[model samples]
Target chain A: DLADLFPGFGSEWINTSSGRIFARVGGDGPPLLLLHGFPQTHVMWHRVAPKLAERFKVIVADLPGYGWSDMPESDEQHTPYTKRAMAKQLIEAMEQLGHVHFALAGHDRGARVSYRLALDSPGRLSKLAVLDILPTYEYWQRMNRAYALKIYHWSFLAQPAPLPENLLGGDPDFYVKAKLASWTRAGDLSAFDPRAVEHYRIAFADPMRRHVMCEDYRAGAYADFEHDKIDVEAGNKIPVPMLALWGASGIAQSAATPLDVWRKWASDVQGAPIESGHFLPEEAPDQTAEALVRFFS
Target chain B: DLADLFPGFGSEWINTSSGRIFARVGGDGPPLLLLHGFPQTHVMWHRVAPKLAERFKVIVADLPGYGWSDMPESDEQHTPYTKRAMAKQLIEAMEQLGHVHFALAGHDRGARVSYRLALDSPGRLSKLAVLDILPTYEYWQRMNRAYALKIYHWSFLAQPAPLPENLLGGDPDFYVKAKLASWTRAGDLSAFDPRAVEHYRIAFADPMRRHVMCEDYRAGAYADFEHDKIDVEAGNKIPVPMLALWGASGIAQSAATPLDVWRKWASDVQGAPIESGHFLPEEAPDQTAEALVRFFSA
Candidate 1:
């Protein structure tokens, strides 16, 4: 439907030996990678990618175990789904595409991977941008009633496996659509592109994908926290110029201002609020795309 | 059966007008009331009540909307399930049996009711001992990661109805038995008498009982907090002496010392930790009964 989605883009399966990573590649300038978050596919970029592609080579990829990507069998610590592991997979694929340095932007879980990549592959990321999130360690350490109540999913989805998987599997479509609708300013499904929403529903409807989603978060809660803690204790910071953007009206980052929080982790950080909700890219494509171009420039 | 369990204890249904409160009444000393916590009826006191009956006239009743009691239709704020409402029902039931004032002790949800009763009707309680709980308002004000993680049900079940009710109803027996096993220090259901286990299983097996249980917590999170706030703001305290008992290994009161916390809201306070888990009455029945007998006697 989005023939122009990644205009002139081609698809391929990058075999990382662990699992096959599916991604769409197009555009001809500097490499700009876009990572999509939970319960949604790379198609989330259909709205914003075309614009970003005008200035940079845009690579939109489904995170491991999401959408059409092959899910590695999750380990006890859910190591396969940790942002560290997920970040490595994306980086390996980027290297395969013959890019040592790339501009990176991620939304939700992808933002989690974005920062993780910047930390693990220091100096590899030329420009980094994160949308609608705080550093995961900062999140768990500063959790309170407001954040707990607002993003109750962080707790619910992270519960010991088979629990969240079972609950979500009951009505996958309802759960997926409800989240996309509720975590918005207007609190409705009106903001999502009809085709994109269908893609999410189709992806989430697969029960295996539902379980993988659980592993994704289980890693975030259990395994990823350790990686974040080690780096934070060692006083490590992202070695890149960073851009942070959040929906001005989103409930994603309530504990502190997003820009101020990002500055602590990145040596040089710049960002402005987007006029949308948690799904910033899809909801405010032009503004999101423009912000990325200016930040990378 | 708890037939020999309570010795001469006689059971009857006390009409509260709103619903019938089923109770076991016996013993011939000063009045002492024992209220049971959630997921169990008055049967939760089967282990400790018989011993308590030796030193005090014990009235053990199921909280309304639980066990054999008639489940009231819940309202938006879960008003019918509020501790204030549940406490009033017990007080009137006690008055029906000709006791004006009494020694009160409760565990979990029952302790919540006991304190609310004490605050709402000060002179009606002679001595108050709350087992394994803190003042509701204090709990909300100081909620933290450990406490919230341990008792995530407080938020989950408090979620507006049908959501929690439906999840629990999915596999009622597995769900009920899991909690009974998990919250204990021993991490096994062995502490529970087989009969009492069956009783809890039977009550929780009812789908309607499951919904009402959610309502009970909904009230705790909503309407009951307001009552606690009002009393605290008005400087109202439980005038009677208070004793606090917590499971030394349980996470319920791990945030603060139960005795020290209780002292802030009561005139007289003295308590020691019980070497048990959240289910003190069953896990350490001897120590629990002995503590109650000694405290209520002095």
Candidate 2:
């Protein structure tokens, strides 16, 4: 049996129209939702969430098709997995938990959902913080040889299903470990808790979850890209006080400039890089929690 | 046992510095070397070689690490698989076969070797024909979303070894058939002989050959691209009479203009779209042979 990483946190399965979202809710104060990114779940916030809980009612939920969240069947458009679709489901989940307008901080894919929610449901977010990613549209637009090599999965995973599924199926553990280790500042998994790593591996081992994971990227490539493209072209900025936090040696730094890219999407934005890699919550949780607490306050 | 597709053709293995090159020699006129592309042996020219042989001495060889050709160990730079090295070996093979100078034609990867040979050893080629490709540098420079999707293998295959090899190792035949079929105008393997498909499958089944194949693309992504970049920057055009033929529905057509792209790399170049897909010799062998015969004649 895996040890409970969050000892005091209470687990709940909230029902949404699409499916159920598995979340860990604890602490007592203003509501603050924490969304986790790709290849991981709500457990990513185990270290950071407890600290934030002392100041705010932290609700860490898995993004759809990730962690213990529902893996709903996606359509040809991959509409079910788009950041817009994910944002909608997340808003419903927060509303069920009596959080009408919550402060939000997300890492990786979670960041995409947070920003998209802030844009689509302008009044739902009191504040927004995105971790270690540029807008999906910005990424596709500025993809060069170096960037392409760095984030090869954006294209590789987005390839029509069964190809990546079959290939990745051969050894999910190896793929997961390799990806996690490579993206770390230390170039290893030392920053991650062993139990948390086990949690991600178990979730990824499920074939349905793996397929849905591919759908998430598929949506990013097509539907989500178009959504960001339209908004970017129309200059529709996120109408929320936004904070952008990225790893010093992360995917976002590979872009032109993380803060500069976010500014184009938000009128009121501030950001700083944590001394970490892609997994800010795990690699530098103390700094991550501090940044969130400061921004939310 | 596989049936002899080239019934009367004589096969010879020529020694080069890196490894031995397997070649099928036939025809009986001025020496003309024909090089086959990836995922297949020299047998890709079975249909066209016989016809071309009537007009010129044809040397159809399997590129290194493919088919019956030697699969040599590669360095970190993938020097063994670079078009320059492959071109060097092909030139040596032609010399051992007693041809000091030759008219050359190649398709896909072989075409890369052909053009590199023309650019590096200018005096060795009387005429040059490249099939269904732009310069390696041109491809990398113009990679965009659509093109990247169309030629995803360029990146996928170039990924550091054992990853692609392991993924592909799961099912080589499926990969081969899928690749061959998708690149065709008809979008199926109807254009290929079943026996030839079996031959390709058998060769790809070897793990060492698969590793070398990845190295081939690694060279393309790094060394070959750099070589072409230096030449492109210096305006070093291929110093030979050149012809380019591409499938009407092929990889090169995706470029701005195949002929225009080639003209930048060659001082004398002309090209047209054949009524086939990527496997020009197999899909439209008659048309392919006709084009080569006419171009090499004058």
Candidate 3:
């Protein structure tokens, strides 16, 4: 009955060199691109973005290895699993759809790609809203016993065993619901529409989506870490209007720190708490949307 | 299995004037009484009260509008309806059941009445525990649109209509599951024994329980508000150690500083947030129990 929560902004598959990109494009204004986080597709933005579409043209798209997007087979350069290679593919996908220069916002893993866009291709991104994350470098530096224990998926998925693969595939809902939930301070799935939670349960219930999630995290340790080191050694600073939205219940910069870790890369930066946990957009959408609307406007 | 959710220290009855009340009597120590908060019975303190029952002979009863208590017939007063007069009725019910010279710990809405009780019977409460709320006055104040709307049920049940009563009462699973999934943070209910949820589901499913709940809030707004004011105006201080356990989430405490508010009404006051919400006992029982134990011990 809830057609909107189903991500029906005219979802069409565009065959790109990146693979077949599944996306929802509607609304009218300067196109504001939206991307989904891990364990979820572009649907995470479904609750918050439609309201924004009343004004700005919102182009919500699924990333490869997520949602209706297909997992590209392993390439000669071993680039399929990396968010950077995927970032290149995403840019090309957008260009193919006639969205060359647009503002963007992303939640969780999607924010990482937004960072890469600001880094790898500057002129293409007008403004960027990054929701609910520490910089990848900061996240790596600060994670400890408690942190590792909380984000145990990052480690467990890094393993080469079939057990992690089996358990996740056994019940896809188990992986999505558990990982998406425990990382939050509050526990109300009703934060979004109840029907939306049901949609998530049914869609992610499939096996293909579950496997791609495992490989993405596995590649995070082996591939992305090395790629990041090489980029840092080369002095990569993102030149864009990047606003980092942290969940008040998560890792945030102390008011005392003036360097503003997010500002470290971007030319300008603003960040605030959304009174939620890691899933700021879903849990505290109106709040996150308020900040994004202000910055983008 | 859920007998533990109800402390079981006291005997229970559905007194016609009130809802279900679990009571205890007899001890060498001064008399004490307690009542449970929303969606729970006096059995909540089933484990803790027996310990207190050993010395003080505590009488813990369910508030009129909730839990296996006798629901006020829906007329002028709502079902599970309560007031300071009704709070007084609980004290009277306890007296009829063999109690006097008592102390009180009213949790949630029971805590709301405990505030009213501290005002109503100044000398009655030796030590008080207002678990998980500010004064009803304090609670209704800071309600903004977004935060207030999130509470959902405040105006929902209060509406002079049969829609909620009919629709919600239809299927107990739909009611309990809808609420349980939404009210607290995710996976919090997993901590409780499955039977506990089933018990809550059954309780909420029954039609009489809904009527009593609707009547309680309606009566509180109309008549019980005065009962609370009269007691407050009487210059009532809890005279004994007063403890208020607030939830960390919004709407659980009135004052930005809960301890400060408790001190205003109590001669010896204490308050703290157990890093939980309205359902403190179920969400964080060990922590909730420990707070009571330490306070009672001290």
Candidate 4:
């Protein structure tokens, strides 16, 4: 039923070392993969994917442990959920789909995975576009009272399990809806398609998915941060042309400067702020798609 | 039922500008006021108060918005829950009990109020003892990954109202029991008296108490931190003799050195780590009472 939004896009579940990755593929030119963020699924790209599909072969896939993807077992170190592991799994899935080298655009958690892929697998991405986030290192390094208050979830979710999972599971619908609405420029669900909201609600309603979400942040706090730290210390920058797009009123804007931060991690980087909030794809799909098409073209 | 823990203690609710302040007054000597911390009532002193009561007129009271104290309406600024406000009301209650000035000991949040009282009313205390905590300013200033992870409730409880309250309200007993057990060195409830645990459980079971608890942290996040900042900038330190007792394995030890942090805020400060965890009163009452007796007696 949710596939109705994708129109002519073909859905496929590809198996990889991490687990089965669910992707919606359509259009025809060069290949482009779109990844969605937290409390949402690939359906987040429903509005923007179709528009971009006209110009490129777009593959919008649910990141592991999200949407219809397999919830792989995580370890004590949360290795399975780290951006490095996620990126590796995603790259394998893409290669299996016959797109060895493709342009990648990701939002939120997906953005974290996309950049990690570009950094670890230097030649895997032709052009990488990260939507609305700083490198994991920058977020932890710059955590202050103001930023800590705004992004309490980073710490809250990363807590030693059951605490956050139990609390969130008490009312997952309210948690998901509140997060989506609050993070938007309009601060409401008016911008999101009704059916798309259902997809997110249903996904979050599963306690296992909620636990996976917490594991994602746990990885963010530990593994992802250390990875970025190691890279920064060694002066290892992204070896591809990177396009950084952030919401004008988004969480990334709260940092020093989104473009400036991205420049530190990538050599060839260009970006501008879109007039939206955290959910740029859903809130301003036209602008989001237009930016993606221009950057990846 | 909890009253049985404190034999021959007289319970009284004194009226202050803030609201009704609850206190359990016992012993008969020079006045010494005791304040209890978070998720606990004045009954936290049941074990220590009687021991100290033998040497001093111990007045153990609940910090405002905790225990049996009247839950005053808070404002956008959370003024009522500020350590300064709670200290003011506590001092007023002591005055009503005919004690013009008194020695004081406070644990956890109460320790925050005790120190605030000393700094704000320099002459109001003959001696001050803060149990298992650093200054509000010190905590925030030293907040890092390790410390933040150790004391996540500082951020969790301080989150904007309704969220923390609602989540905690779901299973108040579980939350309280979990917190009490985890914070102890034993990492279990073995150190706590069953009746005392029941008292804490009953208090936290109320939704209003949980909301007020959140407000207490809200004040800590905003007004309380600012007050400490203003004092630090102006170089105002506690003018009275200060005793800083912390659990050897407590949250304060995680800081730059508990005694060193206190020295920055007080001139005549001295302390040693007790062989226990955060609930020094319950976990090491003998050490806690002996230390207070020695500090104030001198």
Candidate 5:
């Protein structure tokens, strides 16, 4: 039933030294890799991937800890889940697919992984784009009342483990559903495909999976944030050409200007606006795909 | 077990139009009031309060919404939990005790309330001392990574209701004890007497009481911080002799130069160091009492 969502695409589960990754590979021409964010799987790219697949081969993978993917053992420093580790997994996945370099794009959490690959392992990515997020380092420094109240989940999800995992574990399904509904512009659930929403429900139902999600956030705050600080302190700018697109109705706009923040981190960076909530790919699918193709192509 | 802690101090709950206030009153000279901070009750001053009472009338209270006091319903503006509302309650409580004007000191949350009382109710205080805190507005404006990480609870507790409440409600006993142990200089429960520590555990065990604690911090971020900005903008300074004491081993020092931050808001100010953590009165009570006596007396 779910395979129908990706008509021409073939599903393959790639096992790496890191972990097992579930991804959909299809399309032709040059390669394009897509990564998904929190609370959702590669199914998140259902609307955007099909269109982008028309112009370039699209590789959409569930991030290591989400949606049919296998989570690596939880490392104390959260090393396995850091953007650095997740970025390398995709790099190895792409190499296994016979592409040394490819166009890359990520939405929400995937977008963060995309940026890391572009920053940490620069030669592997040709074109890079991040959707609906500012760099993690800037976020921790500039947050105020507006950001604190609106995006408090950054803190809540990143809180020391067992704390968040225990709270969400009690009723993970309801918690994920509530976030999906509330974070959108109209705060409505109808925006998502019923089938796609079910995938999230099934994934979030597992207690270990829920704890794995918290580890992702924990790594984002503890390990990833520390890495970002070192780069920032060293004045290392991402050398690849980069594009940033943020939701007009989401925290990316409400908290701070996307391009203004991105400019400081990238050597050659440009950004445009998207009119959607946090789930830009789903909320405004055509526009998201169109922007991705235009930028990556 | 705890009564032995406050030998001569008398306990009374002052009923104001707003709500009930739990306070320990003692001493005999000019009226002097003391307030405690988060995760603590009036019992925080057991060592300090009695010593100062020998020279002045000491009014130590659990700020409304904490420790045996009534927690008013959270308001749209979060006013009921603001330092202004809490300060007004203490002023009214003092009035009921028959002293129109009195000396004042607050530790942590109470210090915030004490400073607000001096700023908004200037004529009501003869002297004021703030233990281990800077003004809230200064904290919000100058916050950085070190500050944010150390004081993350300022944001965590101030988060919209039910979120923080539910998290703490899961295991209130462990949560309160962890905070007490962590916020002290020793980083252990040893500084706190077993009996005094139980008071916090018993009070924090209530789910609704946990919610009330969050409301106070919510008001700190939303309403109280805004009120401080207005006063700061108007060039209004604390119109009383002020003393600022901070934990040399606490965030008050790591995040800021505490006395320098306080000097900006008070017309007449002096400060000395305390060798403790955020819980100054409890960790170093004798030193805290000596400073209060010297300031209030002179």
Candidate 6:
């Protein structure tokens, strides 16, 4: 489907070098890897990646728990489902899939994971593009009441007590609906079609997926903080050219002064707003893809 | 239609001492006035006013050039329709409607008008409720790209030359949809039903509506600042108990920090955030209505 629409892209699940990894090996020059956010699979880039794959070897993966990947047992021991952990998992998986180095792009939660990858494993990335998140550490630090309220889910899921996950996950659709719903502006509501909402609903149903999500947010609040704090204290910054994008209407930019912070991370940083909601790659793919093409090329 | 929802509420095209006014007057208790905001008619409060009307003799009116109100033409020299001017016109119109004293509750643009109404016509408003807006003056001071982008409409509409109205009016649905769609939070998109979006589309179609919105925002940029500055210098603070409610998700609270700035204008101020968007009264109506019931009753 991607090759038909975007052309110049071809993909296969290559287990040759890495443990069975979903890889796309088309497009020309350098290699590009796309990461998927939670409650979604690599299919998100189904809209933009093939186009880029025509120009670069675009490899997309279904990060372990979601899509076609094998779901590992929930790891509460060390924030296993935590994006930082997922960052390492993805890097390991990619290395197993036969790629030692690649350019990277991630959206929403995937961006959070990709953010850590660029920061913690800077040598692996030639350039980094993160959609819709600043450094989570900066976001949590600068959180005020407004930020707290909008990102209440972050704090909600992070509660030491387990009631929040139970309350939210009691009806996963309700959780999916509300989370998807709150991520936009105040006035525009009739934006997403029913199918679009249903798509997320379908992905969110798996109990394992919900556990992964709850576990990810939990780690973000507890373990990820301590984990990232150590790196942050050591003056860790993404040592690669970075392209950051967030929905103008989303709270990603609100977490930090952003453009200012991005400069601290990368030698060259470029970002702007895309019209739509928190799911920028899925919600406004063309504009996001356009930015990717320009920024990457 | 309002009477269907609010027992005593009735509508009328009232000719008042101020100007021709489109007003809804009914209910039995002390009169309470409800004002409309920009990009809308009195119908914007269709969700909240009737409830307030059930408790008080609610008066809902479309400020001139909006909704069913008769519009009088004005150029730059004529002092374009501003919140202060609209407030004066409203006070006069209510007096003409046999309302000598009343309380006021307004959201967004109307909230700005009510702020001035309290200052410009002291002692008239017994109590007030401002929904989701801080003093317009404070908003601009703290504005950066984040602030500017969210309210990109204010600057876009405030332009007099090559008016955006013509460009926007050409594809009326697109303009209204863009605003309504963009303003909608990730979850509230479905909440803004097709009918609701159309209401705003129709409300903003008239050139009179165009002129009125431009005047309101332009005034906010220039005249409202001067008006508030003078009032502040002269030590004007609303003596009445004011209740302000902003949606936590809405930029009006977290964005403008209205919950804090209300202190500068109101003598006894108490406000907090309900979990919702800018349309707190609609999006989170039960919580918003409950807050008003508690605050206003107290």
Q: How big an interface RMSD has model 2?
A: 1.9
Q: Which regions of candidate 3 deviate over 4 angstroms? A: A1-3, A6-8, A75-78, A251-259, B1-298
Number of clashes in model 2? Answer: 0
lDDT of 5 by residue, B1-298 (tens): 3344678778888988778888888888899888888888888888788789889888878888888788888787778789999999888877887878988888888889999999998999899999888899988886555456567678878866656776676567767887898789998898888888988888888777787778889988889999999999998899799999989987678767988888889989999988998888788888888888899899
Q: Estimate, for each residue in A1-297, the C-alpha lDDT of model 5 and write its tens digit.
A: 444578789998887788888899899989988888888888889999988988999988989878888888987888888999999987887778898989988988898888888889999988899999888887777767667667666777776665677667545666687778877887878889989888888888888888888888888777888888898999998898998998889767876888988998999998988888999899889889898989987
Candidate 3 DockQ score?
0.02
RMSD of each: 3.2, 1.8, 13.1, 1.6, 2.9, 12.0
Residue-level error in angstroms, candidate 3, position A76: 9.0
Kindly report which residue stretches of model 4 are placed more than 4 angstroms away from their true locations once superposed: A1-3, B1-3
Clashes of each: 0, 0, 23, 0, 0, 24
CA lDDT for candidate 3: 0.64
Model 4 C-alpha lDDT per residue in residues B27-46, reported as the tens digit of each score: 99999999988888899898
- Model 1 regions lying over 4 Å from their true place: A1-9, A169-173, A205-208, B1-9, B226-236
For each candidate in turn, the TM-score is 0.89, 0.96, 0.48, 0.97, 0.91, 0.50
Query: Which candidate's TM-score is highest?
Result: 4
Docking class of 3: incorrect
Q: What TM-scores does chain A show, candidate by candidate in order?
A: 0.96, 0.99, 0.90, 0.98, 0.97, 0.85
Q: Which candidate is the best by DockQ?
A: 4
* Tens digits of lDDT, candidate 2, A1-297: 556888898999989999999998899999999999888888889989989999988888989888888888899999989999999999999888888888999988999998999989979999999999999988888766556657778887888766778877867887787778889999878999999999988888888988998999989888999999999999899979999999999999996799999999999999999999999999999998898889888
The 10-residue segment with the lowest total lDDT in model 6 chain A: A1-10
Model 2 Cα lDDT, one tens digit per residue, B213-281: 889988998999999989999999997999999998988988668998888888999998998889999
lDDT of 4 at A86: 96
lDDT of 6 by residue, A1-297 (tens): 112323455556644222345544566678788887756666667677766866777877766556556556665553566676677777887676566788899877778788788777888888889888777676666654345435655654554334344444446765566566566553333444455455557767766666666677776766666766777788766778889888888767667656777776666788888886777766777898898988888
DockQ (model 4, Cα):
0.47
Q: Cα miss at B212, model 1 (Å)?
A: 3.0
Computed on C-alphas against the true complex, the DockQ of each candidate is 0.30, 0.45, 0.02, 0.47, 0.36, 0.02
Write the residue-wise lDDT of candidate 1 on A1-297 in tens digits: 322345568887877756888888877799998999976899999888877878888888889888878999987889889999999888888888888899999999999999999999966799999998888887777665556556667767777656666666555667787789877777888888888898899888888898888888778777788898898899888879898999987755576788887877888888789998889888888899889888887
